[PDB]
Design a protein around this ligand. Structure first.
Ligand code: NA
Ligand code: NA
Lengths: 47, 211, 214, 46, 213, 213, 230
């Protein structure tokens, strides 16, 4: 079976993700930052 | 949602791993036994008991019962017919257990391939970030892989394995009842006492609830 | 209130759990298990100490428990000791198997509920992601996914598994009460004094689970 | 042990956390809303 | 609100764990497990060396321990070996049973605590996500979720599972001590040499976890 | 570009290798690799072919290492005890070798997803710590995602299927060696070809092969 | 290829170590793990397990081939190894075969129990480390949320709390569990060596034929995990 602490790990991961959803609920998108992120991720994945 | 590529990925990965575990002939045999356990119905024990009681009164549709009768007619002792029927029961039990194992293996391998497919889709999307508005919907199709695996691991493969195990128990009960009836027939025991003995098998390990 | 109620989510969880469980149990077996749970929850088992007093209460003379009712009925009809022993042991085995099957039914329900919760939250996540151009109005969309997961967790942990655990506890209480009546019924047939049986009846009263009380 | 659905849940949850961190990396948060959220958290936690 | 969140989280975790466990064990069983845990935590087990010394002391002549007192009472009553051995084995099995049931109770608590933590987390997260436009509601919901997860983890890993492990360790120690007392009483009844039985009982000192030399 | 791929491969593969080398020595790992390579590029001898060969020698009285050992041991050792013991020893050696190889690959497949999770956590920590450098979060997400993907692929598509194939090869080799041992015993006892041919029929449809019939 | 595997494993361990090191985050994990572990093992038992692990990691076990060579040397005749010297002294002082067998079996069982206890301690540490890392992460999250002042600090501080969780994993899968596995391997190696020594001592004392006992020793060498190396 799974480790006994995997339930708490899923709990923590969900808690963190929902905190990030809350943070994004009042966020504002930036286009230049998005372009920089896209370029960096293209560089990272060898494209 | 519906995606041919995602279901193809999940099915292909699960098939590849199972073919690494079992062989193609074993997989086909498991599919055949699952189809026979789904599209056909096992004979009720009450009808079997009634048929054995009628035969005892006079002294044939089930293949096991037909084999038992054919072994009984040609002057054979209890030991040989008992051994043959036990061998047939063991073979049927082994076939059903193997089919259960194949479908269980499919069940535990489906969600891993769902996760692998969704991760591959995520990598492919992150390596081609062009429009922000298409970042959200993208995982949808990627996640379509994982969901499929979960569904196949909980609504198709594991239910089929459980149905195969239930059919295995039912066939074991029916064949044990037929064997007991045959052993009573060769002994020439009274119809009423053997009827009571066979009805004593009606409250088996799963039919007690309906009582 | 309205944030914890969703028809589609509860439909997914309950329909999936029922569909998967019916792949192993017929409808009649499920209804028998539900009847078992109702009997075990709405009724309490007779006290084993109260059973012992009642058995010796009718010993010198020579009624609420149906098992002892059957026992005294066969005693009045005057069957042999073998007949009474076989009938009572058959009834005990039937009750034990019936309770075990009810426990298995509810354990299967509790095992399949959180898997359907995971499936429903995956569906909800897909629906949320297919409609997110910007990550602003995705709160109430994640609400339904976490709601399906919550339904699965609550049903598995606080409804189905406790019922299966209560059914196992009832079986142990029933088994002890069944054995006490069987031994007491045999004593009345033999014709023993009320006091001799009480010496050994209480020896194994604290058996298994009850060992913690002392 | 634990049922494997919990492991699948944990893997999916960590995946979603990673992508949401990516989303918020190039997003600008409102300062007034952030101050309100921080005050609410501070009052809730003591 | 601040204390309301803590009260709600403690209620969720502890009340859910108690409700789930009481469907598995009787309240008398739960109180017996609590008593045995308190006994194993507030009392040190008797050293097998002192037991060996006392046993050889009475063997040379041929009692604070209760099991040793019962064995001595059985020996002094002129009973045969079989009856005394069976009674001592029955007492050993009874002690093993109580300790195993207590370990089971606290293990049940241990696996139920994180499930309640997960349930509380899901409730709080749903309440937060639905009430996104009300800042006064996202705070307490986040606090309830986080604190219920933290309390579940702390109770499962730092309270209930270590208590179960301590109960199992005390069970092993009590079983070893009672077996040592049984062997000493049997040797005294037989009337063997004090040095031979002393060596045989000292052979027990390297059994299991006692390998700390 | 290369840095993140090399870092993910490092994390996953190197962690798996380090843990397994802690478990198994390098020579044992190379033996397991040899066993897997032999089981992947060499079809197991068909049991029906073995029965045909056995009845061929039985009627009269190569191309198989166990058969060569059997005939060489029969041509000198007249007693059946030594031959049976040697054949059983070889069977047990093959079974042990295949079981050890399966254990090695199962250890690899168990440890890989742990390294994937560790890499995910490392990438998450880096991404959260920077959160303002575009050139720093691209590599971090690459590391996390690629560690998870590599762990999943290695555990589910490489190591576990290799272990399962090794188990299948173990079963096939055990059945073939049992058939050869029974044929050697029959030719020692001078049994009729027909009775032994019927006696190996239940040997044929054993376990996995029962589905084909 | 052995050098390549050793180098890649060492490099993975090194990069995980520099990821580990930072001081407080590991301190919480180790303190919680130690506190929980000491409820099952005493302080003396914990130090005994640490000593066993250190001995197994620093020192190397004697090769069974050299043991066979020494055994056959003494068998044909009629030692730095402690167990071999003890057996030789026991058989040369004058005793029955049963006494020597009992003493050697007692020592073998003692070593097996010591290594099993060490393996159990380190497996308990590996089981309890991730939970304590997670608890530290949750405490860090609570502190961060109750001291929430700057959005720019939401990211980094978060990464600090999650750091604790990472350490737990890095300690569970790469320190404690490998140590327990190495302890099990050392237990198997020492059990094989001591069983070989006992068989050789019995053969020398009982005056058995050197060839048959040598074949017996080879048969002993050709089993266990060692089967993969042949
Ligand atoms: Na992503
Ligand atoms: Na990931």
């Amino acid at each position: 079976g799974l480790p006994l602490w995997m339930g708490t790990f899923a709990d923590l991961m969900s808690l963190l993700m929902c905190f990030f959803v809350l943070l994004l609920s009042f966020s504002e998108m930036d286009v230049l930052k998005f372009k920089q992120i896209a370029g960096s991720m293209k560089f990272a994945f060898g494209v | 949602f519906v995606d041919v590529t995602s279901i193809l990925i999940v099915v292909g990965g699960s098939i590849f791993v199972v073919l690494m575990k079992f062989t193609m002939g074993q997989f086909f045999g498991a599919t055949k036994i699952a189809g026979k356990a789904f599209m056909f119905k096992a004979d009720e024990p009450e009808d079997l008991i009634a048929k054995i009681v009628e035969m005892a009164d006079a002294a044939i549709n089930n293949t096991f019962m037909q084999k038992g009768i054919d072994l009984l007619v040609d002057g054979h002792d209890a030991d040989v017919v008992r051994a043959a029927l036990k061998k047939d029961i063991a073979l049927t039990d082994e076939r059903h257990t193997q089919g259960t194992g194949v479908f269980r293996a499919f069940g535990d391998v489906a969600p891993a391939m769902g996760m692998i497919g969704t991760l591959v889709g995520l990598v492919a999307m992150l390596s081609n970030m062009d429009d922000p508005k298409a970042i959200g919907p993208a995982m949808a199709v990627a996640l379509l892989t994982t969901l499929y695996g979960a569904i196949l691991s909980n609504m198709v493969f594991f239910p089929i394995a459980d149905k195969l195990s239930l059919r295995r128990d039912q066939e074991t009960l029916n064949r044990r009842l037929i064997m007991d009836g045959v052993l009573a027939i060769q002994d020439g025991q009274n119809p009423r006492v053997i009827d009571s003995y066979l009805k004593n098998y009606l409250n088996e390990g799963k039919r007690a609830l309906e009582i």
